[PDB]
Design a binder for this molecule. Structure first.
Ligand SMILES: CC(=O)N[C@H]1[C@H]([C@H](O)[C@H](O)CO)O[C@](O)(C(=O)O)C[C@@H]1O
Ligand SMILES: CC(=O)N[C@H]1[C@H]([C@H](O)[C@H](O)CO)O[C@](O)(C(=O)O)C[C@@H]1O
Ligand SMILES: CC(=O)N[C@@H]1[C@@H](O)[C@H](O)[C@@H](CO)O[C@@H]1O
Ligand SMILES: CC(=O)N[C@@H]1[C@@H](O)[C@H](O)[C@@H](CO)O[C@@H]1O
Ligand SMILES: CC(=O)N[C@@H]1[C@@H](O)[C@H](O)[C@@H](CO)O[C@H]1O
Ligand SMILES: *[C@@H]1O[C@H](CO)[C@@H](O)[C@H](O)[C@H]1NC(C)=O
Ligand SMILES: *[C@@H]1O[C@H](CO)[C@@H](O)[C@H](O)[C@H]1NC(C)=O
Ligand SMILES: [Ca+2]
Ligand SMILES: [Ca+2]
Lengths: 449, 446
């Protein structure tokens, strides 16, 4: 009942779970979906949905949030944001369960969207955008998107303060949290953000001519160099949003009793980051990572190493997991290998699981959508730079998915590793999308070699 | 003031759809699920369910009803009944859709259960039982189960009258509507009913020793006759309800502005009917049928021809569709071939579809649970006495199902035949049971 993970988990949260230098990475694999957790509420109505999940867990507690629609699941409809603070516990038999300490349903008149959450010492910090217009309409409006920093504390109270986006995002026409969780580092909470830049603004101008090409493993693009460069450059300005540059950014905010205190926006050079997209900032062991959704031409899961310098951050060449692809519209489908202009893909994050002894990330766990173009066929597996382990299908090849966010941990008492995969899924005819949490133990076949 | 279906369906409701004496019956088959109709409301909550569907459609309108549970789907928790009146329509494109014109959610303190609906000239008639105890407790309770006759009129108003069960069901310890739809015939509404009889009552005395054995096509039971007869006789008094005779019956009520007017309960002899169970009264063309759920040892889908005369009914030797089996617990599983005592099975009705020129029925459409023992794998198809056509699986093999009820009709304009299949189904990670309407066109390999 204590407001902290039960003793069995103490010391098994947020660290490098598996450190192997010999044993092959893909030798580890997910077992069957165990104890179907019930900490995530079902939709309030039978005709509504729960969508856009965000999750983050510290050494003492976890934070979770999702958006609820009462009728249908159309983005152009009123919504309510559900937010919860909880901890990991075990029953007398050892059964793992996520216990909620506090939760709140923000049912006011504000229209919060694309919210990300982070577990901080003060509770559960949330970054949301507040809008009344459509996304395409947002990028059409020169002014930035309103954003707010909120927090559900251990005392159950929720507080929030709107950020001064006029100045904070002066060079932006649209800006949203990346949905994936944020991370607490050196007294500040760090959230991945993305949106569009005001053409010719100081921020835009500094990105002119900047781009980067990430190639697939053992599958080079046939297009001529001059062509790829031309297309790579154009990937930052897709036709979907009228040519505005879609930019990746990182927002850090001081964690204290004053919400929204001293926000600082960092915009990495596009010679490192690809087109802006939904994302997540996470800390595993002593390393920090920024996951970026493959909304552009690059299909394999990206994990940009992230370093912190006071109130700002720096991203380095990303880790890539070639087999951990995502579905997308042509010419940016899962098998794509050439630079192109598109706004597709889906959020399916990879969680750092296996590392070398020198702390270099080697393998990750995640629930990919095993499909070429359509958003369907969710499947959990362990991935390394080029391969995929034995998989565990979430349901059927028909199952539709919109988001999957995974976080792994260890039960020190039994020394077993588990991975939680939260997925917004739906069946061809069982209603709208709804968020479902799944747990799997990470196994290792020894009778193999 | 029946709103009437669009002129495209006129003459295409409640008639013999396919008349053929040459073509192999199973040469006709369902196409892919043409559409996902929206006329059936989803559960009110994300953690609740909608269950026990009933449907019936007459020449001018259709009637539909289902039970709603707020939390979970435990057949015990408090529940409200949803009832609707609507009509068939088509968009300019010719897209078929069911339009609900009137509906009501009965949310009072009374627990209506196992309700059946019927489309009458005055609207939508509903027969329900009202209970304050489990089924087991009811059967152990000497007094009859309360029942009411209600109606949702074209004007949107709902009126209901409790029947005098103390007299009407004096020989019964428990009684419920068959869930399947009822039918309007000769000025009255007819509902299949089932329950248990009071031992030694007049109704029970007349059934004493009566039984009937229906055999599976080319799958003869090896048991010695003496043994088969003894098992058949005991199948009417299964252990599940303490040896009470589970009886099949039919209740007809005069359709008028006065609900529950002049009720008459017919109890067919058990030399014709098997153990009482859920069922439906259907009318196709000038013929009437009683579908009886295979809750006993007989697996193939049953359709007892039904004729009526002055408030009472008479059932005859049934049509049986050997490939249209249903899952059941052993020893009464889908493949069972011998008389046995059990209370299992599931409601999956067959709709009369293909007839001979002489009006004898030869083929039906239905969504069976393509399983041996577990209630899983709903699949639609056309069936004749021995075979099954190409099928159209509803979802996955692991999909659970609790009821399927089908009704077919024709779009006279395009002369195409379609079948509506309503099914209560659920899939592992997507929540409790939910009733979903499916529509398929009937095609032919010729
Ligand atoms: C603020 C916003 O509109 N978020 C939406 C994003 C963006 O439209 C997309 O990232 C722009 O490229 O797409 C989704 O994640 C998606 O496709 O499932 C739904 C989400 O609600
Ligand atoms: C009145 C009643 O209890 N009806 C119930 C029937 C009866 O139990 C059975 O037909 C006769 O005993 O079983 C179900 O169809 C079932 O299999 O789940 C549920 C339904 O609610
Ligand atoms: C297996 C592996 O990763 N080897 C790398 C090598 O590719 C890289 O060139 C070198 C320099 O950093 O570091 C390691 O040796
Ligand atoms: C194959 C076939 O239909 N044979 C029919 C039979 O079904 C029917 O009962 C009988 C009437 O006496 O006439 C024929 O024998
Ligand atoms: C579908 C089927 O099996 N039909 C056969 C039939 O061809 C055969 O003439 C008869 C002999 O008794 O046995 C039936 O079972
Ligand atoms: C860790 O060891 C691997 C072994 O190949 C090597 O590739 C990698 O560069 C090393 N990383 C560090 C930080 O030493
Ligand atoms: C219709 O024809 C079939 C087959 O010829 C026959 O078995 C059946 O008895 C006929 N029905 C009537 C009412 O004559
Ligand atoms: Ca704007
Ligand atoms: Ca009783």
């Amino acid at each position: 009942g204590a407001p902290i993970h039960d003793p069995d988990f103490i010391g098994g949260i947020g660290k490098e779970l598996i450190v192997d230098n010999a044993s092959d990475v893909t030798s580890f694999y997910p077992s069957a979906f165990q104890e179907h957790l019930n900490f995530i509420p079902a939709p309030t109505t039978g005709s509504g949905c729960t969508r856009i999940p965000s999750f983050d867990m510290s050494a003492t507690h976890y934070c979770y949030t999702h958006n609820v629609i009462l009728s249908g699941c159309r983005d152009h409809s009123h919504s309510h944001q559900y937010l919860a603070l909880g901890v990991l516990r075990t029953t007398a038999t050892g059964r793992i369960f996520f216990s909620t300490l506090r939760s709140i349903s923000l049912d006011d008149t504000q229209n919060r969207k694309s919210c990300s959450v982070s577990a901080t010492p003060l509770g559960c910090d949330m970054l949301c955008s507040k809008v009344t217009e459509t996304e395409e309409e947002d990028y059409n409006s020169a002014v930035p998107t309103l954003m707010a920093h909120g927090r559900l504390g251990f005392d159950g109270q929720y507080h929030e303060k709107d950020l001064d986006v006029t100045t904070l995002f002066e060079d932006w026409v649209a800006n949203y949290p990346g949905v994936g969780g944020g991370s607490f580092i050196d007294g500040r909470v760090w959230f991945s953000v993305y949106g569009g830049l005001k053409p010719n603004s100081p921020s835009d101008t500094v990105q002119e001519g900047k781009y980067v090409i990430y190639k697939r493993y053992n599958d080079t693009c046939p297009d001529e160099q001059d062509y790829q460069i031309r297309m790579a450059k154009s990937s930052y300005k897709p036709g979907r949003f009228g040519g505005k540059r879609i930019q990746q950014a990182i927002l850090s905010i001081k964690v204290s009793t004053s919400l929204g205190e001293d926000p600082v926006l960092t915009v990495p050079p596009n010679t490192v980051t690809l087109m802006g997209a939904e994302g997540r900032i996470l800390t595993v062991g002593t390393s920090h990572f920024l996951y970026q959704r493959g909304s552009s031409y690059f299909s394999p899961a990206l994990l940009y190493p992230m370093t912190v310098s006071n109130k700002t951050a720096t991203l380095h060449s990303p880790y890539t997991f070639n087999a951990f692809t995502r579905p997308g519209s042509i010419p940016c489908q899962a098998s794509a290998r050439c630079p192109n202009s598109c706004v597709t893909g889906v959020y399916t994050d990879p969680y750092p699981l296996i590392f070398y002894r020198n702390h270099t990330l080697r393998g990750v766990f995640g629930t990919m959508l095993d499909s070429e173009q359509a958003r369907l066929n969710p499947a959990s597996a362990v991935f390394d730079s080029t391969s995929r382990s034995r998989i565990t299908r979430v349901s059927s090849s028909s199952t539709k998915a919109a988001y999957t966010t995974s976080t792994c941990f260890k039960v020190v008492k039994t020394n077993k590793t588990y991975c939680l995969s939260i997925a917004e899924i739906s069946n061809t005819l069982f209603g709208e999308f709804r968020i479902v949490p799944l747990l799997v133990e990470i196994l290792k076949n020894d009778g193999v070699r």
